[PDB]
């Protein structure tokens, strides 16, 4: 990089979520955008927690380059990071595994196929398997 010098401005110590939240001001002369992964090194090193205690997001770069402003998070423990932070961010940080639920309308069609059967329904498949098997 080229002398990034992250500034972490508007710091609020937030105990009831157990975190420090703040706005991340990133200079970056002569280079492009600054790539969250690199930031979570470069500010866990100054918040002295750990990489995976740190969440960072936003960062719309300034017009005509050279500055980017985003919003940051650093927790106390990585456990209490993982209990409060949204599940999509932990997917971004590797701290979770994206669970494969199906497509939305496909799930819905399964949901409306359950209103048409009362009970456990295994009796019904124990009925069709004799009434249409003869």
């Amino acid at each position: 990089s080229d002398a990034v010098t992250i500034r972490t401005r508007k710091v609020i110590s937030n105990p009831l979520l157990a975190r420090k939240q703040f706005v991340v001001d990133v200079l970056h002369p002569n280079r492009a955008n600054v790539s969250k992964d690199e930031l979570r090194e470069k500010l866990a090193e100054v918040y002295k927690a750990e990489k995976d205690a740190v969440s960072v997001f936003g960062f719309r770069t300034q017009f005509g380059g050279g500055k980017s402003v985003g919003f940051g998070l650093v927790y106390n423990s990585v456990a209490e990071a993982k209990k409060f932070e949204p599940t999509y961010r932990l997917v971004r940080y590797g701290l979770a595994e994206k669970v494969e639920k199906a497509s939305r309308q496909q799930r819905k069609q399964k949901k409306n196929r359950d209103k048409k059967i009362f009970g456990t329904g295994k009796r019904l498949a124990k009925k069709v398997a004799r009434r249409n098997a003869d």
């Binding site: 609020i12 110590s13 937030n14 009831l16 939240q21 409060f84 949204p86």
Partner: protein, 260 residues
């Protein structure tokens, strides 16, 4: 139209909440509570929009459910719980206690109170009657009924309440020379030492008020809340002291004073 409303669209939110016009269609509708809807303030608006302790409403649920936070010594985990005027919001984050009180500008403020003052709230009597088995009881402005009051207390006085219990310590008679906090009305949040009162048998009994700069004004009696004797507040007034200004001296202060 078939029963009550569950929703409340933005644009129909009370304006002192200071929500944004964008970001979503709906605003939190306060649940039924101690306070009226229109002049309440929910906890969600109190946290994420005033204190900025949270960003999302989901974060607010995560705050309230872990219990962390309590109105009037009681935990109150509901998100749209309508906290209102002269209420004491207690957090365990660094022993912060908030008293919801109004401003010059007529908005609820972040007004931090010290913990000894966070014990008690005040409450305007709205009625005094006789309950079943002939028991007298007062009704404060926010629902708190109280059994067996001192019979000197009658309507439109105020009452200091313990909040460890429902016990009253002290009361203030509604009279001239007493400080008045104006809740509701055009003149919301001005503190000004009654001149006198008009009767108007038949409704809407006006009240004359004269603040510390002789800006005499009048509100209706329903927007009156006495908070003590002359210069003697029973609560911690916010920065402003009920000393609403011109627009002309706010360009004295707000761009002439703080500047270099």
């Amino acid at each position: 139209a078939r029963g009550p409303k569950k929703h409340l669209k933005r644009l129909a939110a009370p304006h002192h909440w200071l929500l944004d016009k964008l970001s979503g269609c709906y605003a939190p509708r306060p649940s039924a509570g101690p306070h009226k809807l229109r002049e309440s303030l929910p906890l969600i608006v109190f946290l994420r929009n005033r204190l900025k302790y949270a960003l999302n409403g989901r974060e607010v649920k995560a705050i309230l459910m872990q219990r962390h936070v309590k109105v009037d010594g009681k935990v109150r985990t509901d998100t749209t719980y309508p906290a209102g005027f002269m209420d004491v919001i207690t957090l365990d984050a660094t022993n912060e206690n908030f008293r919801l009180v109004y401003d010059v500008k007529g908005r609820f403020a972040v007004h931090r109170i010290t913990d000894e003052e966070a014990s008690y709230k005040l409450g305007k009597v709205k009625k005094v009657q006789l309950g079943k088995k002939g028991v007298p009881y007062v009704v404060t402005h926010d629902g708190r009924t109280i059994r067996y009051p001192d019979p000197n207390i009658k309507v439109n006085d105020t009452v200091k309440i313990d909040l460890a219990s429902g016990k009253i310590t002290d009361f203030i008679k509604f009279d001239a020379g007493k400080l008045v906090y104006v809740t509701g009305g055009r003149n919301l949040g001005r503190i000004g030492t009654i001149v006198h009162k008009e009767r108007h048998d038949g409704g809407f009994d006006l009240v004359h008020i004269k603040d510390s700069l002789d800006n005499t004004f009048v509100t209706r009696l329903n927007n009156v809340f006495v908070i003590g004797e002359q210069g003697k507040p029973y609560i911690s007034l916010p920065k402003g002291k009920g000393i609403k200004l011109s627009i002309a001296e706010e360009r004295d202060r707000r761009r002439a004073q703080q500047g270099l």
